[PDB]
Amino acid sequence: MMERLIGSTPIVRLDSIDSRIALKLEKNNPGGSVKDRPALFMILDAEKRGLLKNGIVEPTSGNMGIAIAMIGAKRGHRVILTMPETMSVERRKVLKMLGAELVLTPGELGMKGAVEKALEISRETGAHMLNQFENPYNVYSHQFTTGPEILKQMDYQIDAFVAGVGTGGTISGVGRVLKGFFGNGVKIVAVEPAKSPVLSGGQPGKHAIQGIGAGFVPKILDRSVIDEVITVEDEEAYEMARYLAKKEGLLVGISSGANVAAALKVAQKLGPDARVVTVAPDHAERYLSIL
Amino acid sequence: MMERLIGSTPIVRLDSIDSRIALKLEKNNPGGSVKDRPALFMILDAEKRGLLKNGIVEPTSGNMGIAIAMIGAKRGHRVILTMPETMSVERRKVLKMLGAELVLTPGELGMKGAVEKALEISRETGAHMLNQFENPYNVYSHQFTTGPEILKQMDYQIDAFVAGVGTGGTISGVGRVLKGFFGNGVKIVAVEPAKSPVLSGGQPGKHAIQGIGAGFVPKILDRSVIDEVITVEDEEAYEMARYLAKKEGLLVGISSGANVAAALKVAQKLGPDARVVTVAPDHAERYLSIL
Amino acid sequence: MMERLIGSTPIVRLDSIDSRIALKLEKNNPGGSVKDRPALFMILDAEKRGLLKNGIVEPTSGNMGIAIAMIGAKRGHRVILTMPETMSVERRKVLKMLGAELVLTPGELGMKGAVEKALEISRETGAHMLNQFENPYNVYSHQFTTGPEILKQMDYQIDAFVAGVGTGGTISGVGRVLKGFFGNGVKIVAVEPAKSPVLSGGQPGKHAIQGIGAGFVPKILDRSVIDEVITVEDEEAYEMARYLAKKEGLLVGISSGANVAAALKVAQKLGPDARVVTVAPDHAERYLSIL
Amino acid sequence: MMERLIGSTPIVRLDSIDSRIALKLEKNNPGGSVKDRPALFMILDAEKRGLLKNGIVEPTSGNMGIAIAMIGAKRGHRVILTMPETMSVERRKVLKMLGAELVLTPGELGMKGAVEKALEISRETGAHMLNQFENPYNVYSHQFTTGPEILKQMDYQIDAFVAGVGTGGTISGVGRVLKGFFGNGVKIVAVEPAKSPVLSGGQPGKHAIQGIGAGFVPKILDRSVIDEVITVEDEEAYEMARYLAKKEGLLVGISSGANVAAALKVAQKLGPDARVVTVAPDHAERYLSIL
Ligand SMILES: [Zn+2]
Ligand SMILES: [Zn+2]
Ligand SMILES: [Zn+2]
Ligand SMILES: [Zn+2]
């Protein structure tokens, strides 16, 4: 069921915004986000290695936790999530509907606080941490599914791929495929918040772009495939998410707004025949309380 | 964009519930429900007839309104919805995100109250009412998309198709295709609330199964393709929706719970090799406030 | 296996011939032709009615024989095919590969001799005749699969659908759907050989356009959906089939050249933004010794 | 057109042969073989490097010539193919249909003569040689399309992948993906003729298994992904190809019988629930005079 439903998502051209921008719509996944792919890969790996006797505990900003909970619900794994109290309340409710357990961690501690608590619960319960920031299967999910899909959906002609970095899974897996095919003929652009520009060589900080900018450089981030880093302001991301819904009818989340805002800045630096691709990580109904 | 994204949704087998039941997952549509199909068909028809000079006004229990708003947002139509105040608050928020206008009508007046207000606004603004309860394009959407999809996805072997009646579009369009192919070899079962059993020959009444049981028999309901009517209690529908999320990882709405609860009663009356198909009209995140 | 592989074929636009024409590629079917669809439907229907206990006998000089032989091979039905002995060594070989029993009837004579022999085999062995020219399930296969596919693949915008009539199944089933959706907004154009223009009111004659022009009006032909008839000369058909290979890289059969030759004549009488769709029934490699 | 049609081919399970075997049907490609993928990738790469101004010349006796001719026809590249004059009238015809220029070199001699003639044509005309045995884009086509497809189509569960080596492109690219995902959990099995077992450490010889066993080790063969080599006799291959047609209704070529014959040998050494996947490179109707 899950193996079959996850991936093979559609791409749309954003004609009412900039007709050079194509948005891959990951909300079509059964868990409602891109994170279904890495969750599936990391889980199948841990099962075959015999690591899930006591279930799974994973820190999350929301989406990876929802994906793990969904797959765990179907496959019969106990799932515990830790997540900062600052993530949208919709996340908490979804996790509960999926019968997962949740421990909220302090907002000012961000993703590091969630990781810390997850490490504790893992030791206390014996639940296995998939560790999205270090697990190479996160990258393999995008290397073997997302990247191949994007490559063919764009008819093997792409000038730039633009993606927010959360775990770094998406840009790394997709970037490996695209650099493999295009070499220097394609630009791979990482997106991060202006408020937390760690990839640009700056300081971590509080920001509102849920799902990106963890405040540190993930171990799985494959820097050799990344050409540049662009920053996006919080209000830029929200504005674009809202614009996508009103002008394209696309019910996409905050990080999709950030991706598209950044893709627009990329496309403007290039010619009229530029082909720019980005991802819409999730849907707008996960953000009704704040978007 | 919309023409391309709408439809071609997947089917899953509910092994952790009853392995004779296959659920078509309509939440994969870009508007997050089955209603994307009839909305697209009715809109394309009204455009080609030159009826949308002043936009669209339609009454809704939520999903048809969201679909119309989404397509209107992309195609450039002004969209006004009327909807009972008793429908989930998520509906109202989505309509606003899509830049549609909304007039809430009294809860005790139900769908009839919404229709009445929509007729008023139509006259006042000149906006065109697509009229989901009378428009044959509602039925054609399921006759030309949903039904053909279901027929092939089930490898041309179906013992029963089970669906809630809202507008009656789905059961009518799908039932025409399936009766066309199977004749009396397939049973077509209409689902309604026990609290409002109009199709069984009873009285209209207040119920909690959002999206079904409008309290009257729609004009587009094709009674010649319907074999029986089954009733479902409110708590049955909610319980099943919850069970689908916890045991299958399927984030489906209330009417999906009602469909599956009814499909289970159908399958139990049949043999161990029975093939029963139903629809999951929408997703669970449209119901976080109440489910 | 066959239920899964048959149908859902791609469409392409004929940019090197006329960019207003779109070509549905039925050679992508496992039997290499459009006839996989009606054969499947006729066989599933006959199975369901318990009519296949002593196998299948069918008189056929064309793709229906391959489709039947192929489905019969997988499903475990005995398949006897009657064919005038004038049929190519290419076709005999394929039928024999699929384990059909070939009954060759006296030649110049023709298809009548094959029909007569099939009727006696049916009496002598109990084998069931599907009768492709009379069986409504031929039409339903197109009403329930091909037409729905085309409608959506053309994003619900079609000014004309153009198709050769062999059995009349394709034009009738697709025509029903397209008339249903578009009404008089779509023109349905039947194609036939200039040498055998029976649908135009003329006399049957010998022609070389494989797959079309039986020299009678088939029982299953839905005349109510057909707006006009257009004729194609044998050499128009062969020349266009060759051109499709040469300039589009499309290895299509003789009937495909006929369809596209006709569609070209249709398109030229319409505006610059007209949308014309037609079918490529089979593949070139079935005709290497004559094309 | 070609970017859209190539790849995304179906898999079937060989229930009438051994239900542990799954067969990827590459005949569904517009060129009727697996070689559409590497041809597309090699040509797109060469175009991008501006290497195709005077066209393409390639020495090829098999499906690569068809793929190149077909892509060349649509894209507007001059295609010259060199082939020993010992090649069938069937293949010459198809190549000529696609508008390739056929350069026939002295026979018994063989493929070396064709390579030598291509090298001089390249010098004399400026035409660019893709060199399918050395070009890494042959491997990438499978790494980026075929392997990703197989991984998902098998629901991420594969005990063995079995494939004939022609160029070694298919086994290398798929093998990279499957090794990447499964590690030592998957066995990658290369197939070659008993008459020409060079990968097994033996001597090159003449054989009748079309599409495999070039009688050298191709430069692009990723030996690091191959776990074992298995041999197949010419008559094993032809017999299995015939059986696939007869009992599965699958019109597959000679190399497909070889692959399935090998996969059968593999499956028999494994448990009852083993999952073995293999490829059907091309179709039967390309071999009517010998199969
Ligand atoms: Zn596009
Ligand atoms: Zn199933
Ligand atoms: Zn098109
Ligand atoms: Zn399978």
What φ, ψ does residue D283 adopt, rounded to 5°? -110, 155
CA D272 to chain centre: 29
Burial (CB count <10 Å: 0-12, 13-18, 19+), residue A160: buried
Asked if D132 and D167 count as a contact pair (C-beta separation under 8 A), the reply is yes
For residue B195, the tally of other CB atoms under 10 A from its CB is 18
From B5, B32, B249, residue closest to A2, measured CB to CB: B249
List the catalytic residue out of A27, A35, A117, A179. A35
3-state secondary structure of B254: helix
**Residue environment code for B3-27, b if the CB has 16+ CB neighbours within 10 A, otherwise e:** bebbbebbbbebebbbebbbbbbbb
Q: Are strands D276-280 and D160-164 parallel, antiparallel or unpaired?
A: parallel
Count Cα neighbours of C286 within 13 Å in the Cβ-side half-sphere. 24
For residue D79, the tally of other CB atoms under 10 A from its CB is 24
Burial (CB count <10 Å: 0-12, 13-18, 19+), residue C290: exposed
Angle between helices C63-75 and C89-97 (to 10 degrees): 10
List the catalytic residue out of C27, C35, C179, C195. C35
CA distances from C262 to C63, C162, C224, C267 (A): 21, 7, 20, 9
Question: Cα–Cα distance between D119 and D59 in angstroms, integer?
Answer: 9
Query: Which secondary-structure segment (H or E) carries B67?
Result: helix B63-75
What φ, ψ does residue A70 adopt, rounded to 5°? -65, -50
Q: Which residues pair with C147 in a beta bridge?
A: none
Question: Cα–Cα distance between C199 and C216 in angstroms, integer?
Answer: 8
Q: Would you state the torsion angle of the CA atoms of residues D236, D237, D239, D242, taken in this order, to the nearest 10 degrees?
A: 170
Question: Cα–Cα distance between D185 and D180 in angstroms, integer?
Answer: 10
* Among A171, A153, A149, CA closest to A161: A171
C-beta atoms of B4 and C155 within 8 A: yes
Question: Cα–Cα distance between A238 and A256 in angstroms, integer?
Answer: 9
Residue for token digits 């190539």?
D6
Q: Which residues of B touch A30 (CB under 8 A)?
A: 25, 249-251
Taking the centre of ligand 4 as the mean of its atom positions, its distance from the CA of residue D210, in whole angstroms, is 27
Taking the centre of ligand 4 as the mean of its atom positions, its distance from the CA of residue C87, in whole angstroms, is 38
Question: Cα–Cα distance between D272 and A82 in angstroms, integer?
Answer: 41
Q: Which residues pair with A21 in a beta bridge?
A: A276
User: Which tokens belong to C25?
Assistant: 């590629």
Q: Which residue ranges form the domains of chain A, and what is each CATH number?
A: 1-28+146-291 (3.40.50.1100), 29-132 (3.40.50.1100)
From C7, C149, C156, residue closest to B44, measured CB to CB: C156
3-state secondary structure of C197: coil
Question: Cα–Cα distance between B174 and B153 in angstroms, integer?
Answer: 13
* Among A286, A251, A174, A269, CA closest to A12: A251
Asked if C221 and C214 count as a contact pair (C-beta separation under 8 A), the reply is no
C-beta atoms of B3 and C156 within 8 A: yes
Q: Which ligand is nearest to the CA of B12?
A: 2
From C41, C148, C181, residue closest to B148, measured CB to CB: C148
Residue type, D51: L
Interior angle at CA B217, CA B212 and CA B223, nearest 5: 100
Secondary structure letter of residue A196 according to DSSP = S
Q: By what method was this entry solved?
A: X-ray
3-state secondary structure of C242: helix
C152 is an active site residue: no
Residue of B nearest to A25 (CA): B30
**Residue environment code for D161-192, b if the CB has 16+ CB neighbours within 10 A, otherwise e:** bbbbbbbbbbbbbbbbbbbbbbeeebbbbbbb
Q: Are strands A11-13 and A21-25 parallel, antiparallel or unpaired?
A: antiparallel
C-beta atoms of C251 and D31 within 8 A: yes
C-beta atoms of B5 and A13 within 8 A: no
CB pairs under 8 A between B and C: 47
Residues 6 or more apart whose CB falls under 8 angstroms from that of C60 comprise C68, C81, C82, C83, C114, C132
C-beta atoms of A144 and D155 within 8 A: no
CA distances from B285 to A10, A27, A289 (A): 21, 12, 12
CA A263 to chain centre: 16
C-beta atoms of B147 and C144 within 8 A: yes
Documented resolution in Å: 2.1
CA distances from C266 to A120, A201, A214, C229, C231 (A): 73, 63, 60, 10, 11
Q: Which residues pair with A280 in a beta bridge?
A: A25
Question: Cα–Cα distance between B88 and B284 in angstroms, integer?
Answer: 11
Question: Cα–Cα distance between B24 and B281 in angstroms, integer?
Answer: 8
Residue for token digits 């390639």?
D58
- The strand ranges marked E within chain C are 11-13, 21-25, 56-59, 79-84, 101-105, 128-129, 160-164, 187-193, 228-232, 276-280
C-beta atoms of A251 and B98 within 8 A: yes
Q: Which residues pair with C190 in a beta bridge?
A: C163, C229
Burial (CB count <10 Å: 0-12, 13-18, 19+), residue D289: exposed
Question: Cα–Cα distance between C25 and C14 in angstroms, integer?
Answer: 12
Burial (CB count <10 Å: 0-12, 13-18, 19+), residue B50: exposed
SS (H, E, C) chain D: CHHHHCCCCCEEECCCCCCCEEEEEHHHCCCCECCHHHHHHHHHHHHHCCCCCCCEEEECCCHHHHHHHHHHHHHCCCEEEEEECCCCHHHHHHHHHCCCEEEEECCCCCHHHHHHHHHHHHHHHCCEECCCCCCHHHHHHHHHHHHHHHHHHCCCCCCEEEEECCCCHHHHHHHHHHHHHHHHHCEEEEEEECCCCCCCCCCCCCCCCCCCCCCCCCCCCCHHHCCEEEEECHHHHHHHHHHHHHHHCCCECHHHHHHHHHHHHHHHCCCCCCCEEEEECEEHHHCCCCC
Residue type, A66: I
**Residue environment code for A219-256, b if the CB has 16+ CB neighbours within 10 A, otherwise e:** ebbbeebbeebbbbbbebbbebbbbbbbbbbbbbbbbb
Question: Cα–Cα distance between D38 and D171 in angstroms, integer?
Answer: 12
Residue of A nearest to B72 (CA): A249
User: Which tokens belong to D275?
Assistant: 């999952």
Greatest CA separation for chain C: 58
Angle between helices A234-248 and B63-75 (to 10 degrees): 100
User: Which tokens belong to B185?
Assistant: 């070899």
From D4, D97, D288, residue closest to C90, measured CB to CB: D288
CA B8 to chain centre: 16
CB pairs under 8 A between A and B: 114
How many angstroms separate the CA of residue D87 from the nearest CA in chain C? 15
To test the contact with chain D by mutation, choose from C288, C289, C290, C291 the residue with the greatest count of D C-beta atoms within 10 A, namely C288
User: Which tokens belong to A191?
Assistant: 């997106």
Taking the centre of ligand 3 as the mean of its atom positions, its distance from the CA of residue C11, in whole angstroms, is 7
C-beta atoms of C145 and B143 within 8 A: no
Residue of C nearest to D27 (CA): C28
Greatest CA separation for chain D: 58
A255 is an active site residue: yes
Interior angle at CA B261, CA B258 and CA B265, nearest 5: 135
3-state secondary structure of B190: strand
Taking the centre of ligand 3 as the mean of its atom positions, its distance from the CA of residue D276, in whole angstroms, is 38
Q: Which ligand is nearest to the CA of C157?
A: 3
Count Cα neighbours of B219 within 13 Å in the Cβ-side half-sphere. 8
Residue of A nearest to B246 (CA): A98
Residues 6 or more apart whose CB falls under 8 angstroms from that of A91 comprise A62, A63, A65, A66, A83, A286
Secondary structure letter of residue C24 according to DSSP = E
User: Which tokens belong to C149?
Assistant: 């596919």
Question: Cα–Cα distance between C107 and D280 in angstroms, integer?
Answer: 37
User: Which tokens belong to A268?
Assistant: 């403007």
Question: Cα–Cα distance between A122 and A14 in angstroms, integer?
Answer: 43
CA distances from B48 to B67, C181, C225 (A): 19, 11, 20
C-beta atoms of C8 and B152 within 8 A: yes
CA distances from C78 to B250, C56, C57, C70 (A): 44, 6, 8, 11
- Per DSSP, the residues of A205-248 read ---S-TTS--SS--TT--GGG--EEEEE-HHHHHHHHHHHHHHH
Secondary structure letter of residue A110 according to DSSP = H
Question: Cα–Cα distance between B142 and B41 in angstroms, integer?
Answer: 10
Residue for token digits 């994973």?
A58
Question: Cα–Cα distance between C107 and C87 in angstroms, integer?
Answer: 9
C-beta atoms of A155 and D8 within 8 A: no
Asked if C159 and C270 count as a contact pair (C-beta separation under 8 A), the reply is yes
Q: Which residues of D touch C286 (CB under 8 A)?
A: 285
Q: What is the CA radius of gyration of chain B?
A: 18
* Among A71, A15, A24, CA closest to A281: A24
* Among C213, C195, C194, C214, CA closest to C205: C195
Residue for token digits 């005309």?
D125
Question: Cα–Cα distance between C4 and C153 in angstroms, integer?
Answer: 19
* Among B135, B138, B119, CA closest to B127: B119
3-state secondary structure of B215: coil
Residue type, A198: V
Taking the centre of ligand 1 as the mean of its atom positions, its distance from the CA of residue A208, in whole angstroms, is 31
3-state secondary structure of B7: coil
**Residue environment code for C124-162, b if the CB has 16+ CB neighbours within 10 A, otherwise e:** eeebbbbbbbebbbbbbbbbbbbbbbbbbbbebebbbbb
Taking the centre of ligand 3 as the mean of its atom positions, its distance from the CA of residue C157, in whole angstroms, is 10
Taking the centre of ligand 3 as the mean of its atom positions, its distance from the CA of residue C22, in whole angstroms, is 6
Q: Which ligand is nearest to the CA of C14?
A: 3
How many angstroms separate the CA of residue D146 from the nearest CA in chain A? 10
Question: Cα–Cα distance between C119 and C127 in angstroms, integer?
Answer: 9
Q: Are strands A11-13 and B187-193 parallel, antiparallel or unpaired?
A: unpaired
Question: Cα–Cα distance between A242 and B156 in angstroms, integer?
Answer: 43
